[PDB]
């Protein structure tokens, strides 16, 4: 099988973790240092990725599902580690000169293209809220770092569960001062499967035929 | 190098693409199957993928640049394909109903839990519209899709260039019956880079560093 193919067609949902088995600190640096170079709109950047590693930080996480989405709330502590993947409420022109000021010590720009590369910011002015957030702008991008999050495990041959059956609200309660100017929709949880209580991991994938989901023109 | 962080960190935006290359067919079903492929809430696959091939479809596409961001305009009849990442609009059990049936045939579910297996559709009304619209809930799966792409695209070595500088109302009107329930927000040209105009190919990356976008609890 093409290696690609091969990958995708492996990796799956966990439904059920060993708690015994984690993931190496190695595995883990390749995988946030892939998070990190994500693309986004402008380079933007506009997201933060928490991981919940250490047992207070998942005492934590599962007290999130106090209230709803209870099905997911068993992986918490059953995993190796869980990612929040939290997006910016606003984007603002400071928040952007942060990402120029960095292109010109990385050698992208010099402070000459770099007032003229401010312009790239009205990309970002055009998409906003009512109120004046940019969330339904910014929102996508993290889906887009999580797109490339569940290609990169499939690649370490990691198991994990995509989890948007979680509480926002609350779990900017709980995790108050790192959700700070950021929400957060998606997160997940990441390790090995239970070697025979996975059901999912004997079911085969199901997808729609080619011709539904693609057209060529 | 780690084979994943060369793959990620070799990828670029191409900013000029060479006309005498195109992408072999071979490589391209290799992409659509991994688009096929990318998970999905619910596994509702809330999306449609068109290819814009032939060079009637270049011209139409190269059409929907008539009144904004011209800047994406060259690269369209230059790279070899174009793919529009479309989202569908609003999302029902009818449309559910096509997952669950070809589960069924690809073996996933047995006929008798197709019922049951509807359970799962209470998380799409969840994120039902006051419009009844989905659209701000399958934008981000299309996202995801594309984040999955560009890490598939790197490891092809095929060049591409990610477009959110595009026209969603006249592409709506030019690619009336494809996107018929639909809406697309972003686009993706592929191909291989121009070798000496495309100044983008020996600029570094640059990225926010660890400690801004990663936080370990
Ligand atoms: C954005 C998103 C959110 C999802 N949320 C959940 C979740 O809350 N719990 C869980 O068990 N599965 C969740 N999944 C898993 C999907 O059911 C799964 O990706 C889809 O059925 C395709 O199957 P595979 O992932 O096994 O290919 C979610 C997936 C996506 C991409
Ligand atoms: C959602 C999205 C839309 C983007 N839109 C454009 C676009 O319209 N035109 C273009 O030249 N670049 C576009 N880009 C490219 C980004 O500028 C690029 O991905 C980012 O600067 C990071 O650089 P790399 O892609 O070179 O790593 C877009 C990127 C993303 C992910
Ligand atoms: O990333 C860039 O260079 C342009 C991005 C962009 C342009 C126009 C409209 C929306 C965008 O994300
Ligand atoms: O994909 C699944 O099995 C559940 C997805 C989900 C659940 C609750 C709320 C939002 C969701 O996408």
Same mark, same amino acid.
């Given at each position: 099988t093409h290696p690609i193919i091969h990958d995708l067609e492996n990796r799956y949902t966990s439904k059920?973790?060993?708690?015994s088995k984690k993931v190496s600190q190695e595995d883990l640096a390749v995988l946030l240092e892939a998070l990190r170079l994500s693309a986004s709109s402008i380079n933007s950047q506009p997201w933060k990725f928490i991981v919940i590693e250490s047992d207070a930080a998942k005492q934590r996480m599962h007290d999130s599902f106090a209230n709803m989405?209870?099905? @997911?709330?068993?992986?918490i502590k059953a995993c190796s580690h869980v990612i929040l993947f939290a997006n910016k409420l606003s984007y603002t022109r400071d928040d952007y000169d942060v990402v120029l000021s960095k292109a010109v010590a990385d050698k992208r720009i010099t402070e000459e293209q770099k007032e003229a590369a401010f312009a790239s910011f009205k990309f970002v002015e055009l998409n906003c809220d009512? @109120?004046?957030?940019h969330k339904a702008w910014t929102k996508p991008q993290a889906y887009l770092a999580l797109g490339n999050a569940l290609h990169t495990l499939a690649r370490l041959n990691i198991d994990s569960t995509t989890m948007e059956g979680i509480d926002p609200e609350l779990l900017s309660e709980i995790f108050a001062d790192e959700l700070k100017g950021y929400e957060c929709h998606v997160a997940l949880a990441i390790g090995y499967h239970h070697?025979?209580?996975?059901?999912?991991?004997?079911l085969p994938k199901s997808r729609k035929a080619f011709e539904d989901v693609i057209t060529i023109l």
């Open positions: 059920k973790y060993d708690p989405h209870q099905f @997911n709330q068993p992986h009512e @109120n004046g957030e070697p025979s209580e996975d059901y999912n991991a004997s």
